[PDB]
């Protein structure tokens, strides 16, 4: 399959990237170096992951080594919830740029629609436990994102974990200057996201699927939770194709015209996950995988469920 998808800013985005949430800081430099050496050209990052400096060491070394050129890389990061303030967006972006050793990002996302009170804590809480919101809305934050394009800090802007009425709000913004290029959302066979994906694709927004393997390293994993990688129905499709279950789980979103960002810090798996360009799932395979939907989320931002902009009370 073609390796890149055209975005609505005119740039091409690699359809397979390396995820970095939970990648330990003492392992992620090597993970990203290995990834670039074996062909990855897209790294998904975020300030909240607390490892952008170490990701940046890898990127910089591979640029210095002339393994790749900067124009060939597609580096994504995200604006954390405590920086939804007109006066904080540029500095948040610049801190990410400084940590990643870059002078621009290919794509910068609003990480969640919910703004939180600024300060040192990523999840500022009241004495009773609930997230303390910001009064800044998704439209003013969007305007601040647009300024980053106009200042040359980022080539594209987008959103993450926006439901379709939140995407619609962005699209309907008075005076909208740049449409979102991407909506990055959780997507896998147990949370297949057909409604949100069709909405976004109909609007020309590219969808990136996160947690495509079901995030087995998520910190809140419970033994009785479903497991994609161990689902024997998925294993059977993999066996039929002489591929791993992970490889099927990665190819699946690719054939839905999605970008996909599996995370690994294991060198052998980083390579395995890239070897997804030499087989095709049939339409029957695709529909069968879609049939496994159970509306199951890895990421439900459960502390934030009263925030007025919490995304997952809406059907989609």
Ligand X SMILES: NC(=O)C1=CN([C@@H]2O[C@H](COP(=O)(O)OP(=O)(O)OC[C@H]3O[C@@H](n4cnc5c(N)ncnc54)[C@H](OP(=O)(O)O)[C@@H]3O)[C@@H](O)[C@H]2O)C=CC1
| Contact call for residue 77 and ligand X (CB under 6 A) | no
Distances from the Cα of 79 to the Cα of 31, 103, 176, 194, 222, angstroms: 23, 16, 19, 26, 29
Where does residue 209 rank: exposed (0-12), middle (13-18), buried (19+ CB within 10 A)?
Answer: buried
- Comparing CB distances to ligand X, the nearer of 115 and 214 is 214
Instruction: Identify whether the C-beta of residue 13 lies closer than 8 Å to the C-beta of residue 107.
Output: yes
**Interface residue with ligand LDT, options 112, 178, 190, 252 (CB under 6 A):** 112
For the CA atoms of 215, 218, 223, 227, the dihedral, rounded to the nearest 10 degrees, stands at 0
Instruction: Identify whether the C-beta of residue 252 lies closer than 8 Å to the C-beta of residue 16.
Output: no
The verdict on whether residue 273 carries a ligand-binding annotation is yes
Q: Is 40 a catalytic residue?
A: no
Rounded Cα–Cα distance for residues 111 and 262 (Å): 17
Contacts with ligand LDT: how many residues (CB under 6 A)?
11
Residue written as token pair 């670039």: 36
**Interface residue with ligand LDT, options 49, 108, 142, 162 (CB under 6 A):** 49
Residue written as token pair 């995407």: 167
**Interface residue with ligand X, options 203, 241, 269, 275 (CB under 6 A):** 269
Which of ligand LDT, ligand X, Cl ion, none lies near 92, with the C-beta cut-off 5 to 8 A by kind?
A: none
Show contacts with ligand X in window 90-129 (CB under 6 A): 111
| Site track for ligand X across 215-244, x = CB under 6 A | xxx-----------x--------------x
Residue 172: CB partners within 8 Å, gap ≥ 6?
none
Which of ligand X, ligand LDT, Cl ion, none lies near 301, with the C-beta cut-off 5 to 8 A by kind?
A: ligand LDT
Rounded Cα–Cα distance for residues 246 and 276 (Å): 10
Q: Which residue is nearest to ligand X (CB)?
A: 19
| Contact call for residue 51 and ligand X (CB under 6 A) | no
- Comparing CB distances to ligand X, the nearer of 148 and 260 is 260
| Site track for Cl ion across 56-85, x = CB under 5 A | ----------------------x-x-----
Instruction: Identify whether the C-beta of residue 262 lies closer than 8 Å to the C-beta of residue 273.
Output: yes
Using CB under 6 A, list all residues that contact ligand LDT. 21, 46, 48-49, 81, 112, 114, 299-301, 304
* Known binding-site positions for NADP(+): 10-19, 211-273
- Catalytic positions: 49
């Amino acid at each position: 399959m073609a390796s890149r998808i055209l975005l609505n800013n005119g740039a091409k985005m690699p359809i397979l990237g390396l995820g970095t949430w939970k990648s330990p800081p003492g392992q992620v430099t090597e993970a990203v170096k290995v990834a670039i050496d074996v062909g990855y050209r897209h790294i998904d990052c975020a300030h909240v992951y607390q490892n952008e400096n170490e990701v940046g060491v890898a990127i910089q070394e591979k640029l210095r080594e002339q393994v790749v050129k900067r124009e060939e890389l597609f580096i994504v990061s995200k604006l954390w919830c405590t920086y939804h303030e007109k006066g904080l967006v540029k500095g948040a972006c610049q801190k990410t740029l400084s940590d990643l050793k870059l002078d621009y990002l290919d794509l910068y996302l609003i990480h969640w629609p919910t703004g939180f009170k600024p300060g040192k804590e990523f999840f500022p809480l009241d004495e009773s436990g609930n997230v303390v919101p910001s009064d800044t809305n998704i439209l003013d934050t969007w305007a601040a994102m647009e300024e980053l394009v106009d200042e040359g800090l980022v080539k594209a802007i987008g959103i993450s974990n926006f439901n379709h009425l939140q995407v619609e709000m962005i699209l309907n913004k008075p005076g909208l200057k740049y449409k979102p290029a991407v909506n990055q959302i959780e997507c896998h066979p147990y949370l297949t996201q057909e409604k949100l994906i069709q909405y976004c694709q109909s609007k020309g927004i590219v969808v990136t699927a996160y947690s495509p393997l079901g995030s087995p390293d998520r910190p809140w994993a419970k033994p009785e939770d479903p497991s994609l990688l161990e689902d024997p129905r998925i294993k059977a499709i993999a066996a039929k194709h002489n591929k791993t279950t992970a490889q099927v789980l990665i190819r699946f979103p690719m054939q839905r015209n999605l970008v996909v960002i599996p995370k690994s810090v294991t060198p052998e798996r980083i390579a395995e996950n890239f070897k997804v360009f030499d087989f095709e799932l049939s339409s029957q395979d695709m529909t069968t995988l879609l049939s496994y939907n159970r509306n199951w989320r890895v990421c439900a931002l459960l502390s934030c469920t009263s925030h007025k902009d919490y995304p997952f009370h809406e059907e989609f």
